[PDB]
Amino acid sequence: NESVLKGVANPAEQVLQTVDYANTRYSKLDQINASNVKNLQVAWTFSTGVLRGHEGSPLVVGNIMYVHTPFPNIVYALDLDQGAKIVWKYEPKQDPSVIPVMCCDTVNRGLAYADGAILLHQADTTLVSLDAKSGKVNWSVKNGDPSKGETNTATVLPVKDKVIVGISGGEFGVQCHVTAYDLKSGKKVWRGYSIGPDDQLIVDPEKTTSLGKPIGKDSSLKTWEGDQWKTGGGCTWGWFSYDPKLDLMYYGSGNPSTWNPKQRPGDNKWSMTIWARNPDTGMAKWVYQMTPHDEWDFDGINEMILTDQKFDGKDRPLLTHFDRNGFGYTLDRATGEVLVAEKFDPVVNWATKVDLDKGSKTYGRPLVVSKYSTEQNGEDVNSKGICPAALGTKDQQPAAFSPKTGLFYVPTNHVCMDYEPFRVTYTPGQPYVGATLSMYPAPGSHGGMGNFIAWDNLQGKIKWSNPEQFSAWGGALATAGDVVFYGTLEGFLKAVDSKTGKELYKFKTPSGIIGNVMTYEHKGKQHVAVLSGVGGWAGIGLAAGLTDPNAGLGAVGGYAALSSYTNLGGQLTVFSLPN
Ligand SMILES: [La+3]
């Protein structure tokens, strides 16, 4: 919306979960700089009344802060003039059946503001637009049916007069889509599936290119055996970016449903693909599959940070992506030409590299290593030693970009995985996994499960990296004060230097941070705030109370020591300078 573009241009507000349309997560405020964030103190706190996983980050537009929760996805409107008093509250009624039909915690990844309306995508696949000053329902539409195993954990994307939302359910045999609804009306405009025939992919067979060449007719179904594409996966629970100068919406599709690969023959397109669609029509100008025929649930849902950089001496519209598979992709966001595809974790071993010799015949395909390939070892056989784990080198936690240092501050994971798949029959509403997993820290390092690194995407190199005991599940935020903020799973809110990376601030929030750092300015004073409350898929053992080491799809036993540092939470901590 133009409202959204109006809000981005004002740095004192946060109208998008991704800070800006480009998902740079870059703040122009420089009051809290690299030489005074040592002197940061807590401004005020606020609790949500909700436990389990608090992902995302609160909105502020003007003098009202909008806070979201996990299930049942309550929204609080806090009047900053009234001392964070709750102006209005919207607690929606949703059925508790929806929670066992969520793979990956009750998490919700936040709100969006557009044209005097707050838009919330509930866990039961319900897109609601609330009045920004009232909290009254303008309209409400159900995007999917959790009956069939379809939930939502992601946020919305408001573009012009439309709102494009995603759907989750990769672990439940859902064939998925990215759907746009009218801002004022709530009426469905178009729906572009990740999988299926060309008419609901919204693809042009002769004009939409992948790796420069047109994808042709029946691009999806040529890689699927029979009607397994209807149970085909490829869902959309990540962040979406948008370029107004190119009129293109960018997202990534998730896993090809089942975790057993020989039961799932073919390239399984278009799962695990960078998508670039039109906002009004929904049909894609270009696309690119990063992980053809996924064997490890390396969901390509992660944010695509849109940059304008100089590549090879020529200024080029760029798109940078940190996939779970372990490769930091740099792409032309206009053509789709894959420029850089290097590893941002040196212990990743499932592929030697991504083949980028333009005439290599394996062009654009990662060279899968035979020893770390779950299908080549076969069903009912344990694939030991795969790095990264199924949660990937980096999961939902969004990376930040600073246009002044030109680097990408990405919070990563340092865990690996034992993998053993097996055949499972699909049943609607039930899990469609087919794998027993067990995770552990990376074997040849400092024993920690995470790293906060800076990334040069124009050459594919790690400039510096800060190790962390547990993973770095908190979203990063870079600001013009040459500081980068991020939250750890022991409850720490850390601020480091933009170039050097040395820790400058460290504060213990009440629970582990899986949310993203935001900042705002109220009455001329800059405040930065972060949501606490551990969960997601790194805290699934604490969120669901799981005790078995193999439960939680392998992550419950891997993060066993996490309960020595934190419990469940649901608090928002706001920071500022003393002035
Ligand atoms: La998945």
In three-state form (DSSP H/G/I as H, E/B as E, the rest C), the secondary structure along 196-259 is: CCHHHHCECCCCCEECCEECCCCCCHHHCCCCCCCCCCCCCCCCCEEECCCCEEEEECCCCCCC
Task: Using the mean position of ligand 1's atoms as its centre, give its distance from the Cα of residue 491 in Å.
Answer: 26
- Residue 464 is labelled as binding a ligand: no
Task: Using the mean position of ligand 1's atoms as its centre, give its distance from the Cα of residue 254 in Å.
Answer: 6
Task: Tell me how crowded residue 272 is: count the other CB atoms within 10 A of its CB.
Answer: 30
Task: Tell me how crowded residue 145 is: count the other CB atoms within 10 A of its CB.
Answer: 14
Instruction: Give CA–CA dist 87/66, Å, rounded.
Output: 10
Q: Edge to edge, what strands does the sheet with 400-402 contain?
A: 400-402, 407-413, 450-456, 461-468
DSSP 328-371: EEEEETTT--EEEEEESSTT--SEEEE---TTSSSTT-EEE-ST
For residue 187, the 8-state DSSP code is -
| 575 CB-near residues (< 8 Å, 6+ apart) | 40, 41, 42, 43, 493, 507, 527, 528, 529
Handedness of CA 470, 418, 52, 103 (dihedral sign): positive
Task: Using the mean position of ligand 1's atoms as its centre, give its distance from the Cα of residue 76 in Å.
Answer: 30
Task: Tell me how crowded residue 376 is: count the other CB atoms within 10 A of its CB.
Answer: 15
Instruction: Give CA–CA dist 82/68, Å, rounded.
Output: 19
Short-list 179, 88, 77, 87, CA closest to 126: 179
Task: Using the mean position of ligand 1's atoms as its centre, give its distance from the Cα of residue 384 in Å.
Answer: 20
What is the residue type of 430?
Q
Angle at CA of residue 389, ends 383 and 508, nearest 5° = 150
Task: Using the mean position of ligand 1's atoms as its centre, give its distance from the Cα of residue 421 in Å.
Answer: 15
- Residue 168 is labelled as binding a ligand: yes
Task: Tell me how crowded residue 33 is: count the other CB atoms within 10 A of its CB.
Answer: 16
Task: Using the mean position of ligand 1's atoms as its centre, give its distance from the Cα of residue 170 in Å.
Answer: 5
For residue 72, the 8-state DSSP code is T
Pairing of strands 284-289, 209-210: parallel
Q: Edge to edge, what strands does the sheet with 213-214 contain?
A: 213-214, 209-210, 284-289, 273-277, 248-252, 241-243
Which phi and psi angles does 251 have, rounded to 5°? -155, 175
321 membership: H or E segment, kind and range:
strand 314-322
Which phi and psi angles does 19 have, rounded to 5°? 65, -65
Instruction: Give CA–CA dist 389/489, Å, rounded.
Output: 18
DSSP 14-42: B-STTSSTT---EE---SS-TTTGGG-EE
Name the β-bridge partners of 521: 526
Name the β-bridge partners of 485: 477, 495
Angle at CA of residue 169, ends 166 and 170, nearest 5° = 105
Task: Using the mean position of ligand 1's atoms as its centre, give its distance from the Cα of residue 298 in Å.
Answer: 7
DSSP 508-568: E-SS---SB-EEEEETTEEEEEEE----TTTSHHHHS---SSSTGGGHHHHTGGGGGT---
Task: Using the mean position of ligand 1's atoms as its centre, give its distance from the Cα of residue 74 in Å.
Answer: 25
Instruction: Give CA–CA dist 7/17, Å, rounded.
Output: 12
Instruction: Give CA–CA dist 179/165, Å, rounded.
Output: 5
Instruction: Tell me which residue has tokens 């007719």.
Output: 217
7 membership: H or E segment, kind and range:
helix 2-9
| 313 CB-near residues (< 8 Å, 6+ apart) | none
Name the β-bridge partners of 419: 383, 437
Instruction: Give CA–CA dist 507/495, Å, rounded.
Output: 9
Instruction: Give CA–CA dist 98/319, Å, rounded.
Output: 34
Which phi and psi angles does 495 have, rounded to 5°? -125, 125
Tell me the residues surrounding ligand 1 (ion) with CB < 5 Å. 170, 255, 297, 299
- Residue 55 is labelled as binding a ligand: no
For residue 63, the 8-state DSSP code is T
Task: Using the mean position of ligand 1's atoms as its centre, give its distance from the Cα of residue 318 in Å.
Answer: 26
Residue 194, burial from CB neighbour count under 10 angstroms (0-12, 13-18, 19+):
buried
Residue 359, burial from CB neighbour count under 10 angstroms (0-12, 13-18, 19+):
exposed
Own/partner long-range contacts of 371-377 (Cβ < 8 Å, ≥24 apart): 373/295, 374/261, 374/295, 374/296, 374/419, 374/420, 374/421, 374/435, 375/261, 375/262, 375/293, 375/295, 375/421
Handedness of CA 560, 564, 570, 575 (dihedral sign): negative
CA-CA-CA-CA dihedral for 480, 470, 236, 423, to nearest 10: 160
For residue 172, the 8-state DSSP code is G
Residue 170, SS3 per DSSP: helix
Task: Using the mean position of ligand 1's atoms as its centre, give its distance from the Cα of residue 297 in Å.
Answer: 5
Under 8 Å between Cβ of 139 and 94 = no
Q: Where are the beta strands (DSSP E) in 32-111?
A: 41-47, 59-61, 64-68, 75-79, 85-90
Residue 97, SS3 per DSSP: helix
- Residue 295 is labelled as binding a ligand: no
Under 8 Å between Cβ of 26 and 499 = no
Handedness of CA 27, 29, 33, 38 (dihedral sign): negative
Short-list 80, 27, 164, CA closest to 522: 80
Q: How many CA atoms lie within 13 A of 548 on its CB side?
A: 7
- Residue 277 is labelled as binding a ligand: no
- N- to C-terminal Cα separation, the chain: 36
CA-to-CA separations, 519 to 238, 476, 527, in angstroms, rounded: 21, 11, 6
Residue 146, SS3 per DSSP: helix
Here the tokens at position 28 are 């122009």
* Resolution of the structure, angstroms: 2.8
Residue 108, SS3 per DSSP: coil
CA-CA-CA-CA dihedral for 402, 407, 412, 418, to nearest 10: 150
For residue 144, the 8-state DSSP code is S
- Residue 299 is labelled as binding a ligand: yes
Instruction: Give CA–CA dist 248/21, Å, rounded.
Output: 11
Under 8 Å between Cβ of 546 and 538 = no
DSSP 431-496: ----EEEEEEE-TTSSS-SEEEEEEETTTTEEEEEEEESS---SBPEEETTSEEEEE-TTSEEEEE
Instruction: Tell me which residue has tokens 């959204």.
Output: 4
Here the tokens at position 473 are 């599940």
Instruction: Give CA–CA dist 77/86, Å, rounded.
Output: 5
Instruction: Give CA–CA dist 195/231, Å, rounded.
Output: 9
Handedness of CA 143, 149, 153, 159 (dihedral sign): negative
- Residue 171 is labelled as binding a ligand: yes
Which phi and psi angles does 26 have, rounded to 5°? -110, 130
| 374 CB-near residues (< 8 Å, 6+ apart) | 261, 295, 296, 383, 386, 419, 420, 421, 435
Residue 465, burial from CB neighbour count under 10 angstroms (0-12, 13-18, 19+):
middle
Instruction: Give CA–CA dist 1/22, Å, rounded.
Output: 14
- Residue 170 is labelled as binding a ligand: yes
Residue 293, SS3 per DSSP: coil
Angle at CA of residue 304, ends 343 and 359, nearest 5° = 55
Under 8 Å between Cβ of 571 and 46 = yes
Short-list 332, 254, 365, 342, CA closest to 300: 254
Under 8 Å between Cβ of 66 and 113 = yes
Q: Could you tell me how far CA 536 lies from the centroid of its own chain? A: 11
Short-list 326, 330, 378, 319, CA closest to 349: 326
Task: Using the mean position of ligand 1's atoms as its centre, give its distance from the Cα of residue 228 in Å.
Answer: 16
Here the tokens at position 462 are 């790690």
Residue 297, SS3 per DSSP: coil
For residue 405, the 8-state DSSP code is T
Pairing of strands 477-479, 26-27: parallel
Under 8 Å between Cβ of 476 and 25 = yes
- Residue 297 is labelled as binding a ligand: yes
- Residue 237 is labelled as binding a ligand: yes
Short-list 544, 575, 563, CA closest to 70: 544
Instruction: Give CA–CA dist 108/341, Å, rounded.
Output: 30
Task: Using the mean position of ligand 1's atoms as its centre, give its distance from the Cα of residue 255 in Å.
Answer: 5
Instruction: Give CA–CA dist 101/258, Å, rounded.
Output: 15
Task: Using the mean position of ligand 1's atoms as its centre, give its distance from the Cα of residue 299 in Å.
Answer: 6
Instruction: Give CA–CA dist 411/393, Å, rounded.
Output: 9
Each domain of the chain, given as residue ranges in start order, spans: 1-579
CATH of domain 1-579: 2.140.10.10
Here the tokens at position 209 are 């290119």
Task: Tell me how crowded residue 83 is: count the other CB atoms within 10 A of its CB.
Answer: 8
Name the β-bridge partners of 348: none
Instruction: Give CA–CA dist 259/553, Å, rounded.
Output: 11
Task: Using the mean position of ligand 1's atoms as its centre, give its distance from the Cα of residue 404 in Å.
Answer: 35
- Residue 482 is labelled as binding a ligand: no
Q: Could you tell me how far CA 127 lies from the centroid of its own chain? A: 18
**Catalytic residue annotation:** 297
Instruction: Give CA–CA dist 160/183, Å, rounded.
Output: 8
Instruction: Tell me which residue has tokens 């372990």.
Output: 326
Under 8 Å between Cβ of 489 and 414 = no
